[PDB]
Amino acid sequence: ACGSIVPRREWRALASECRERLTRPVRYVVVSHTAGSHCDTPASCAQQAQNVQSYHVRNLGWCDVGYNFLIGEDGLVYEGRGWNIKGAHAGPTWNPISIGISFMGNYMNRVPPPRALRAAQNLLACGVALGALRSNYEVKGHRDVQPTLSPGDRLYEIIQTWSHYRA
Amino acid sequence: ACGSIVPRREWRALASECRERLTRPVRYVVVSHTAGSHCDTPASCAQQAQNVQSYHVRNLGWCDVGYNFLIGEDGLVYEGRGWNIKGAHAGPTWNPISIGISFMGNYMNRVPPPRALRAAQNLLACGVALGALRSNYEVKGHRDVQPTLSPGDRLYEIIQTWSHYRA
């Protein structure tokens, strides 16, 4: 088990119905925030991934949670659509050429804790390590590719300092 | 770099006074339990890591927490002595030739949750990737190399199914 990713079944996900595959290795990573509630325990962040997926599935009518992975302030990564299934998180130009990771919260006036950030970068290395990502992958913030405040001012200024970030 | 580890400072560890280095690559991994209180959040697990360190330093007179790494039921790994410094967790024959990882809890009547187990296994893969552990490393229960009940019956039964387990 590559990163220490919480599997779909462990956060009680509805089964996915998405079919569209991403072509590896993938070039881009897009970092979003959920603009949802935050959580900082495994129990609270499992519920929160449930809740986000529930909105996407029941309400937006999507095949699964839109993000490939979610990050909790518990410092764990929650399997969304995964490495191999095209996401619904950054519009039609970016969904097919990226992995979308989303921090569970609103980081406009808040920073995610260092454990959340470590879990994100550990996830990405793990992606390289598996061949899901390019070794020279490029990180975009959600607002760099779509009109939105996502991932929040505070979170966005941090991912700007990441070695793989490209505006 | 590899994995995600909660660093010493983040859990508010006393400065280490330990100096003896292990010789890489290390061949053996010894898995214990602390036989202490469990914790299932980053906040409670950081506290617990302090308590364990406090006990070993202040009461037992050791140079640091005895373990190289601790595992919380929050699903995070807590930095102890690290990959490079000799632990105090398995006696004078095993301490110089092993990495000691301890699950924070009492696993006599109780299993650690899948996320603790994942954190532990991934940690070891990272030791391998790092050259800290041999690729053909062996995992031992604490009871395999010393008389005590550690790492606890339930947890012992689990580590017996790990692919690197050798009695």
Ligand SMILES: N[C@H](CCC[C@H](N)C(=O)O)C(=O)O
């Ligand atoms: N490569 C990872 C280990 C994960 C196992 C992965 N190789 C798989 O079987 O999918 C690492 O060293 O962090």
